[PDB]
Amino acid sequence: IAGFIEGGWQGMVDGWYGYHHSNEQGSGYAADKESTQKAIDGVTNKVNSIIDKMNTQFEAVGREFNNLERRIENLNKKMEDGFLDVWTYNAELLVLMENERTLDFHDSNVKNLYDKVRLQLRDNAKELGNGCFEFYHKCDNECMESVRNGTYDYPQYSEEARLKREEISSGR
């Protein structure tokens, strides 16, 4: 299973961002609760802000001018069309800008999760370039969980990782 650089996971059905592991105990998916919940809060606030910050009051819109008051009727027409153009232009552009902001917001969160993992593993693992890391050592389910939270023990596996790193690079 590839990672974020390739596309989304249909197997991730419990969160927005998360992990997929593959060891000798099998594979599986695990979502990052904190970054998923905070992202959901931010998008929820953004949508609510766009809706709740609009001020509306009572207005009675009609046509109460006779055939010898056409100049005033034209003034009403110019005002109504002017407000139509202002709201139409602002609403279309605002949605386009905020949609771009939201999709860029998702990309940053995924990269931050990737960079947190890459810092822990250091040279104990190899970056495949698809969003995945191949471990230069055996990483069981408890080891995988230590990467998902921030408790990965680099010096524990460094000796094993070093031996297997040289074999791969020498062509063995």
Partner 1 sequence: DPGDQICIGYHANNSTEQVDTIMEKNVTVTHAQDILEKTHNGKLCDLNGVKPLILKDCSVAGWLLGNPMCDEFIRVPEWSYIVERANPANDLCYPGSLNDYEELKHLLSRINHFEKILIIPKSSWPNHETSLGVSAACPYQGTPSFFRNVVWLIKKNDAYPTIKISYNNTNREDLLILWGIHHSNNAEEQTNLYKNPTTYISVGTSTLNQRLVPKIATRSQVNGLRGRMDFFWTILKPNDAIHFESNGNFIAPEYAYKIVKKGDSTIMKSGVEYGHCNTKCQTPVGAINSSMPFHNIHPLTIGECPKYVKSNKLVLATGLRNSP
Ligand X SMILES: *[C@@H]1O[C@H](CO)[C@@H](O[C@@H]2O[C@H](CO)[C@@H](O[C@@H]3O[C@H](CO)[C@@H](O)[C@H](O)[C@@H]3O)[C@H](O)[C@H]2NC(C)=O)[C@H](O)[C@H]1NC(C)=O
Out of 25, 27, 44, 88, which residue is the one contacting a second copy (CB under 8 A)? 88
Q: How many residues bind ligand NAG (CB under 6 A)?
A: 5
The entry of a second copy, partner 1, ligand X, none that residue 76 binds, CB within 5 to 8 Å by partner kind:
a second copy
Report the C-alpha gap between 4 and 129 in whole angstroms: 10
Task: Note whether 120 and 128 are within 8 A (CB).
Answer: no
Binding to partner 1 in span 29-58, by CB under 8 A: 41-47, 49-51, 54-58
Tokens of 149: 């939270």
Closest CB 53 distance from partner 1, rounded Å: 8
Q: In the set 80, 153, 166, 167, which binds partner 1 (CB under 8 A)?
A: 80
Near ligand NAG in 95-154, by CB under 6 A: 142, 145-146, 149, 151
Cβ atoms of 86 and 118 closer than 8 Å: no
d(CA 172, CA 143): 26
Tokens 């680099």 -> residue: 154
Measured distance CA(136)–CA(113) in Å, rounded? 20
- Our measurement of the distance from residue 9's CA atom to the centroid of its chain's CA atoms, rounded to an integer in Å, reads 13
Question: Across the strands, what pairs with 26?
Answer: 23
What are the residues binding ligand X (CB under 6 A)? 142, 145-146, 149, 151
Contacts to a second copy by CB under 8 A: 2-5, 49-50, 53-57, 59-61, 64-65, 71-72, 74-76, 78-79, 81-90, 92-94, 96-98, 100-101, 108, 112-113, 115-116, 119-120, 122, 126-127, 129, 154-155, 158-159, 162, 168-171
